Amino acid sequence: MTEYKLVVVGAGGVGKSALTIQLIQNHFVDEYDPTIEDSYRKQVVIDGETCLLDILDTAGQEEYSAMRDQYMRTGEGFLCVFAINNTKSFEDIHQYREQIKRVKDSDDVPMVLVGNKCDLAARTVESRQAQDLARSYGIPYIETSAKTRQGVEDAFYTLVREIRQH
Ligand SMILES: Nc1nc2c(ncn2[C@@H]2O[C@H](COP(=O)(O)OP(=O)(O)NP(=O)(O)O)[C@@H](O)[C@H]2O)c(=O)[nH]1
Ligand SMILES: [Mg+2]
């Protein structure tokens, strides 16, 4: 069957693993469990198409940047995750996108911009600022909450559709 190699990237603690575990295991993980590098593989039916979602969950730790070129190189599509209550994570989005472009030798790469932790009332990044950034990249912007599940499937499934149209 068709396989989609998805790679979740973003600064430490923005909820990359929480979003990936919500989608696969239907549970909100609220534990301190920094990620090194993990892979999830699950059969799903998306728009009637049988396909394998192969999702690599990456570390936000910079200690692993050699490990980064490698997985970014094999990825078909990317979820760039920042948190709506961490302005630095939003700023560090540029760095991840510009690394992806250089590892993929392409101006355009299937990608979705994800503003996570939207269940929290203490917001420091305005949805409009993120939307404007996404618009300049030419990619869609989706706000998610791993804790309530808002926009989770949407984020992942959309990315798959952007891969389909590439
Ligand atoms: N309120 C709220 N907390 C969230 C949300 N997503 C993740 N968190 C919390 O944020 C913390 C970090 O989540 P985690 O998924 O481990 O982040 P990560 O990006 O995978 N970290 P790392 O880069 O180290 O692997 C956890 O305490 C988790 O419960 C969310 O949507 N809402
Ligand atoms: Mg993690």
UniProtKB/Swiss-Prot annotation:
Activity regulation remarks: Alternates between an inactive form bound to GDP and an active form bound to GTP. Activated by a guanine nucleotide-exchange factor (GEF) and inactivated by a GTPase-activating protein (GAP).
Pathology noted in the entry: Costello syndrome: A rare condition characterized by prenatally increased growth, postnatal growth deficiency, intellectual disability, distinctive facial appearance, cardiovascular abnormalities (typically pulmonic stenosis, hypertrophic cardiomyopathy and/or atrial tachycardia), tumor predisposition, skin and musculoskeletal abnormalities.
GO biological process, one term: cellular senescence
Effect caused by changing Q61I: Moderately increased transformation of cultured cell lines
MF terms in GO: G protein activity; GDP binding; GTP binding; GTPase activity; phospholipase C activator activity; protein-membrane adaptor activity
Resulting phenotype, P34G: No effect on interaction with PLCE1
PANTHER family recorded: RAS, DI-RAS, AND RHEB FAMILY MEMBERS OF SMALL GTPASE SUPERFAMILY
Catalytic activity: GTP + H2O = GDP + phosphate + H(+)
EC main group: hydrolase
Protein name stated in the entry: GTPase HRas
Effect noted on mutating Q61L: In melanoma; strongly reduced GTP hydrolysis in the presence of RAF1; increases transformation of cultured cell lines
Gene: HRAS
Cellular localization per UniProt: Cell membrane; Golgi apparatus; Golgi apparatus membrane
Keyword line: Acetylation, Cell membrane, Cytoplasm, Disease variant, Glycoprotein, Golgi apparatus, GTP-binding, Hydrolase, Isopeptide bond, Lipoprotein, Membrane, Methylation, Nucleotide-binding, Nucleus, Palmitate, Prenylation, Proto-oncogene, S-nitrosylation, Ubl conjugation
Function summary: Involved in the activation of Ras protein signal transduction. Ras proteins bind GDP/GTP and possess intrinsic GTPase activity.
N-acetylthreonine modified-residue sites: T2
Record note on modification: Palmitoylated by the ZDHHC9-GOLGA7 complex. A continuous cycle of de- and re-palmitoylation regulates rapid exchange between plasma membrane and Golgi.
Effect in UniProt of substituting G12V: In CSTLO, bladder carcinoma and CMEMS; constitutively activated; interacts and recruits PLCE1 to plasma membrane
N-acetylmethionine sites (modified residues): M1
Residues annotated as binding GTP: 13-18, 29-35, 59-60, 116-119, 145-147
Cross-referenced Pfam families: Ras
Cellular component, GO, one term: Golgi apparatus
The keyword Membrane appears for this protein: yes
Positions occupied by motif Effector region: 32-40
Residues that carry a glycan: T35
Record carries keyword Cell wall biogenesis/degradation: no
